[PDB]
Amino acid sequence: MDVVIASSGGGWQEAQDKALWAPAAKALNITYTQDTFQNWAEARAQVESGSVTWDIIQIGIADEPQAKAAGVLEKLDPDIVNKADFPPGSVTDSFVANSNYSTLIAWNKKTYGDNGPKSMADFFDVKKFPGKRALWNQPIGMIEAAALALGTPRDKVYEFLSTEEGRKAAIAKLTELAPSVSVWWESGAQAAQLIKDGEVDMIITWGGRVQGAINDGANFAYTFNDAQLGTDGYAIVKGAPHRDAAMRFLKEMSKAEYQKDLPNSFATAPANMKAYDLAKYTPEKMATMASAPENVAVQYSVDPNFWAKHAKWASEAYDNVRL
Numbered sequence: 547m548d549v550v551i552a553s554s555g556g557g558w559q560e561a562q563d564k565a566l567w568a569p570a571a572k573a574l575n576i577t578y579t580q581d582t583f584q585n586w587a588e589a590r591a592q593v594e595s596g597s598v599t600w601d602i603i604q605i606g607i608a609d610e611p612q613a614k615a616a617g618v619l620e621k622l623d624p625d626i627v628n629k630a631d632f633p634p635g636s637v638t639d640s641f642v643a644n645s646n647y648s649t650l651i652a653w654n655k656k657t658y659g660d661n662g663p664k665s666m667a668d669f670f671d672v673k674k675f676p677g678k679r680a681l682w683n684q685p686i687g688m689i690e691a692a693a694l695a696l697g698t699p700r701d702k703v704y705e706f707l708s709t710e711e712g713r714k715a716a717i718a719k720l721t722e723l724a725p726s727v728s729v730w731w732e733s734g735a736q737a738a739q740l741i742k743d744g745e746v747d748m749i750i751t752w753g754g755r756v757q758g759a760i761n762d763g764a765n766f767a768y769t770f771n772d773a774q775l776g777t778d779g780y781a782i783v784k785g786a787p788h789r790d791a792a793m794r795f796l797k798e799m800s801k802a803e804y805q806k807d808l809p810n811s812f813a814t815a816p817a818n819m820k821a822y823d824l825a826k827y828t829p830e831k832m833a834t835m836a837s838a839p840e841n842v843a844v845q846y847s848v849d850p851n852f853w854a855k856h857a858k859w860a861s862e863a864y865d866n867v868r869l
């Protein structure tokens with residue numbers, strides 16, 4: 547009977563539940579159940595198994611093309627949101643954005659002090675910055691990081707990765723870093739734990755997770771330099787048992803009145819542009835936001851068009867680097 551909503555756990559899930567899910571469900575007088583997952587392939591596994599239990603799944607803008615093509619996503623209702631309220635391309639026929647985030651470089655202050663890695667070239671520099679690296683066990687932001695470490699300008703990341711030559715060089719660069727990678731982190735909360743325990747010297751992970759660990763007492767610092775500007779959002783699983791109830795829930799939770807509370811404790815940036823006027827965030831709060839003008843200036847946006855074409859190559863090639 548409950549609409550089942552799934553995200554990636556930890557601080558990020560707690561922020562969505564507190565700001566969006568609990569108030570939207572209360573306003574619609576509906577009951578919902580939470581679940582946790584780390585990859586859209588788990589939703590693909592449900593659809594292919596012939597037994598769908600999830601209604602709404604929280605995925606990334608670059609997972610959307612792959613998931614839609616594999617028949618994992620329901621087509622959303624046309625005016626579920628007003629597209630003018632969200633950044634361009636962040637709302638498709640099968641995806642509604644809820645936030646922007648950064649896949650960025652964090653470093654251990656006990657290891658490097660203020661003299662930590664401030665670029666991808668620095669992150670990949672085991673000679674100037676010796677120590678334990680941690681990278682995601684999934685490729686989005688990881689392949690691009692290698693491309694940046696090779697000296698590719700931020701605005702040319704996907705131009706360099708369009709060639710089979712650049713795609714191979716990126717994997718070779720990750721292969722060269724691989725002996726220095728002590729942990730291939732799987733979840734945002736695990737990444738936050740590695741940071742809190744100082745188990746790693748540097749890490750490429752999500753800004754909200756990093757800020758959360760620092761808030762919790764981690765002696766780490768970070769930068770938006772060379773970070774990938776990502777977009778998180780929601781999709782309804784093809785064959786969702788509570789499809790029309792999930793459509794109603796998704797429409798409600800996308801509203802500015804809920805979106806405004808999304809960064810209250812967790813360092814994320816709401817996607818509904820109308821939320822900023824309602825919350826009137828302080829410049830200090832804005833500085834932690836991935837989509838803040840000064841932060842965007844040193845980042846590059848993830849390109850779903852690249853992932854729509856090269857994900858399978860990336861998934862297999864990156865698995866080998868880790869193995």
Ligand SMILES: NC(=O)CC[C@H](NC[C@H](O)[C@@H](O)[C@H](O)[C@H](O)CO)C(=O)O
Pocket residue numbers: 553554558583584585586604605606609645646647734752754755778813814815
């Ligand atoms: N939008 C945010 O602020 C959260 C950012 C970041 N989300 C990245 C991912 O989208 C992650 O949740 C998962 O891999 C995804 O939901 C599972 O497919 C995080 O969990 O830390």
Ligand SMILES: [Ca+2]
Pocket residue numbers: 555556557558734735738755758
């Ligand atoms: Ca966390």
Ligand SMILES: [Ca+2]
Pocket residue numbers: 742744763764765766
């Ligand atoms: Ca510490």
Ligand SMILES: [Ca+2]
Pocket residue numbers: 766767768769
């Ligand atoms: Ca910092």
Ligand SMILES: [Ca+2]
Pocket residue numbers: 607775776777847848
């Ligand atoms: Ca983006």
